[PDB]
Amino acid sequence: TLSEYVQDFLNHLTEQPGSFETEIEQFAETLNGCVTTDDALQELVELIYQQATSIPNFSYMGARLCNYLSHHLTISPQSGNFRQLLLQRCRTEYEVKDQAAKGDEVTRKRFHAFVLFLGELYLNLEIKGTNGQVTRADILQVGLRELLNALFSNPMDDNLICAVKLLKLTGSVLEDAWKEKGKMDMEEIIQRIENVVLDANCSRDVKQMLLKLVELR
Numbered sequence: 001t002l003s004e005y006v007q008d009f010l011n012h013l014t015e016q017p018g019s020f021e022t023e024i025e026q027f028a029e030t031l032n033g034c035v036t037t038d039d040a041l042q043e044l045v046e047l048i049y050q051q052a053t054s055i056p057n058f059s060y061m062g063a064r065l066c067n068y069l070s071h072h073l074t075i076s077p078q079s080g081n082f083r084q085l086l087l088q089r090c091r092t093e094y095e096v097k098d099q100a101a102k103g104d105e106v107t108r109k110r111f112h113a114f115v116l117f118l119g120e121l122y123l124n125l126e127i128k129g130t131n132g133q134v135t136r137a138d139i140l141q142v143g144l145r146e147l148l149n150a151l152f153s154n155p156m157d158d159n160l161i162c163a164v165k166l167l168k169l170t171g172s173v174l175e176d177a178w179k180e181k182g183k184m185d186m187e188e189i190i191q192r193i194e195n196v197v198l199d200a201n202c203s204r205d206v207k208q209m210l211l212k213l214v215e216l217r
Contacts, residue, residue: 003047010051013061020064028072028166038077045085051089052117053093053110061125061172065118068126086141090118094143101150105158112162119166123173141177145172145185152192155200164209171217173176187217 008028013020032059048069052062067092093100093114100111122140128134129135142168151163167174167189178185193214197207 002043005034006044007051010048010055014055014058015049015064019134020061023063024068025072028069032074035073035075038079041073041075041077041082042078045089047084049086053114055115056109059113059116059120059172062073063124066121067124067126083125086121086125087137087145090121091139094118094147096149097150098153098209101154101159105156106146108156108158108162111151113156115151115162115166116169118143118147119135119170122170136173136177141174144174145189147191149192152189154169154197155196156180156207157202160196160200160202160206160210164213167213167217171213174217190214190217 012023012111031044033180035044036217048062052066054060066082066086068085070081070161073082075081097111100114100186101108103111118140122136125137126134127137127138148163148166151159151166174187193210197214200207
């Protein structure tokens with residue numbers, strides 16, 4: 001089945017991160033021969049999306065794999081390409097982020113995996129722009145800002161640690177994009193972080209991590 005093939009390959013990348021470069025072409029090639037329906041494309045997207053948002057430490061690999069397949073799969077069905085379906089799928093979970101940042105620490109591990117997968121996707125998913133230049137996904141730029149708002153609004157240590165990671169990852173790229181468009185988001189994020197540090201009952205070391213970000217941005 002497609003799902004056995006894909007899941008085997010994802011397990012393989014998880015166990016052997018080094019094998020991406022030498023096995024990715026064969027993976028794309030095999031998928032090109034077998035992913036021929038809108039349905040099969042949708043299922044491929046779902047399997048990779050699940051691995052990236054479950055499975056710890058699959059953020060970077062997930063996003064790198066997503067970008068690769070978005071450029072190397074030849075199927076372009078009427079209803080959406082890989083890129084397009086992925087981005088749609090991300091909006092689905094992103095819609096429940098206000099609730100996802102509550103719950104309990106174990107349930108939130110999946111939310112954090114989703115947040116960082118989206119951060120890595122934003123950095124690494126290359127889209128040919130309207131002017132033919134490489135651009136980043138807009139819906140991800142917007143989603144990241146809202147995810148940060150959700151994480152700071154529920155200032156439990158593990159939520160704050162997730163926000164710190166996401167901003168170390170994407171913060172300079174975000175800062176640049178907001179400034180090109182004369183937006184004040186980084187200022188607003190900085191005030192949110194300062195209010196956490198002033199008010200929240202989180203750990204001292206997490207507060208100190210937040211303060212280091214205020215120096216840099």
